[PDB]
Amino acid sequence: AAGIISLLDEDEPQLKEFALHKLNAVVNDFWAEISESVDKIEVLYEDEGFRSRQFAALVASKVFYHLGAFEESLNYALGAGDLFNVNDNSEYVETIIAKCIDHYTKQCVENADLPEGEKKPIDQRLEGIVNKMFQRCLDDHKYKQAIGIALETRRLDVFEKTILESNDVPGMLAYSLKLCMSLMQNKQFRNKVLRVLVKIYMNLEKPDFINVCQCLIFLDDPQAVSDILEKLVKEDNLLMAYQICFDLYESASQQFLSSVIQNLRTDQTLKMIKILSGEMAIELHLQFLIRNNNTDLMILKNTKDAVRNSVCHTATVIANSFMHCGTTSDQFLRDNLEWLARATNWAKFTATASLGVIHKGHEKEALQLMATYLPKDTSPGSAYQEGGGLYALGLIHANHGGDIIDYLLNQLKNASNDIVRHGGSLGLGLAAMGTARQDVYDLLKTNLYQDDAVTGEAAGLALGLVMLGSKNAQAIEDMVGYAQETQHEKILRGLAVGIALVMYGRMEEADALIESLCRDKDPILRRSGMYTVAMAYCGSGNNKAIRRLLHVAVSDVNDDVRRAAVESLGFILFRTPEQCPSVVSLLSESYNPHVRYGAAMALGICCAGTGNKEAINLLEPMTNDPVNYVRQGALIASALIMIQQTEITCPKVNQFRQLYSKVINDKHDDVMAKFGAILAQGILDAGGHNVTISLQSRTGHTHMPSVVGVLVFTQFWFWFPLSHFLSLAYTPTCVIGLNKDLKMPKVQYKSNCKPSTFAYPTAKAKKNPARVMPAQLKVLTMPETCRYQPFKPLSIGGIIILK
């Protein structure tokens, strides 16, 4: 090879061309020669006189194959000048260009996250070759690959033009945004990509309202949904109009539905307002529920004869509440008037709250219905029932706005400050959840500032509830300041969850508040901070949140803080249940009983109702822990997990069922231990095997009511009356179908599967909505044999209208 160096020592442009010929002819057959001549070639690198000056960079790139320095190849390509693009493919040129492309994508993301501009552009040839390879992909018609490069390129232009890869718009072109939702987290990038893709979609011939709802539900464009609804109204296709209305109503948060309704308001308009109005969907849902019930008295009798004459009275009443949640069938309790006549004046408050819960959704007649058991009518001397009446009234209109809010406001205004105001304020706050109205905020703050303990905790819970995810700095500063300012635990314990619920759904946005609460000395303030972390990062796998939470659980001495932390961990990872058991496994076996209890609760909440077949697997051994605390934790977790399941779907359901019975039958068991068993039974069979728990909407929008309910339940370890809040987290799996405004349809979908699961106390099925589960819903067959057919598929249940 010595000729190479010897010739290079000579100075002549023709000599340079000869060096070019020989070296590009032999790149690796002789490598140390060029490896040492790197000096000569790099000094020639920068020389305008050199005719083949770009060929110096060409040499660098080509014959630094042994030199693994990536940046070396990067600069070699940058200076390559012309040959970089030409080298579409070869032995190793393809590798170096691919490496350059990935590095260019890295630089693009790095400088694009920089949002204020003044981003140092990369060498032009790099994006030139990037676009050339994009063109090669277009030729190969690999739409998925092209879009993946576009997003990793962090450039929405390529993302937009990728739709020209095949120009058919069957799927990905109009439906890969779902894949993007699944596998990305950058909210800033999220909004821009979402708006771009929805623009692409409505640019299509038919603006499919299903994909148009993305703006409203993910990008929160209430004005946009209002405008498209106005376009539909002037276009006179009421079918699609109320279809999208119901879709958003069941898959959207009221906070902006209010603005949508305002825009719509300022016939077809009246019908639109009604459907985007006080929950005629709820009315028909409750009609569906009463029309179909499967409840067993024998369970109530088995509880009754197993009466313990102890606290589990409250557990029994709440279990019966869960049994017929919203069924308005108290005869199971009306038959015997002693279960509610053998309790301390305090538990009876919970009993009347349960009575209210059983009666959920009537709204219109709720006034007179509650007056029927009115505190003055029932027991004027029992102010506990006085407060329970207002609590029940508030529970009835859960998230259901109306004059009940103002009525409860007035009642609280004219009433005792402490003895009764607890339940009344709590119910008023619940009924005005997220309404953000100042007329209720003022009353709540006054109540908080009435330096009272018995009712102040409920006042603070309501205060947090009303300002749901508002991020209103005024409220958060007020509440945090008042928290450290008082000298009561109950007040502070309530204010903890109140703060946590104040601001949420912001991922890593309220980190200042998170850190402030985390560093606070008070253990209960730390618990409040952990709950705030959970609620803010709800339904996401933010690694920072997981790391902070796990470190807290490992370190913090106060077992309560650790338990709250593990509960939060369960909360934030529900969208990916498969992974939750893996992390919870180690926690399952720890020295600290509280750690194990919180781990069990976290598993239960994370897996929700779907049975991973490993959650129960871990719970079973955990279902025999010596500590009673762990005993009820495991019972409740198993009950929550197994809800709605069947024997065939989960072989273990029988065991726990039987197990539950025995733990409510044996007498030697700890009373506090059994206190969870009755609630476990009630949850497992809650709502006549119709209601269901699910924090994610079928459209992917997270169910705020479910999250709030589960959080309050988790908080119910420090207070019993709070259990009723699980009523909010109950969405039955019934599939609702209606052709016209009220035209009930005679459709009977053929499940084309063995009933088995359906008949929970010949492949086919018939039915209006029925107790059909998401797993069975996905298998249902749409009966085209009838004249009218559904507008949208029946892949999954919900309210699918027909034509």
Binding site: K144, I147, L179, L183, V554
Partner: protein
């Protein structure tokens, strides 16, 4: 759809490493 496979693989990797560091810290603490 190799893009999705790569994305989910990366998610699994990050989750695994965070779990690992947590376990290390927990064992360290339990020693005391």
């Amino acid at each position: 759809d190799l893009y999705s496979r790569y994305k989910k693989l990366q998610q699994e990797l990050e989750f695994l490493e965070v779990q690992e560091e947590y376990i290390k810290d927990e064992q360290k603490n339990l020693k005391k």
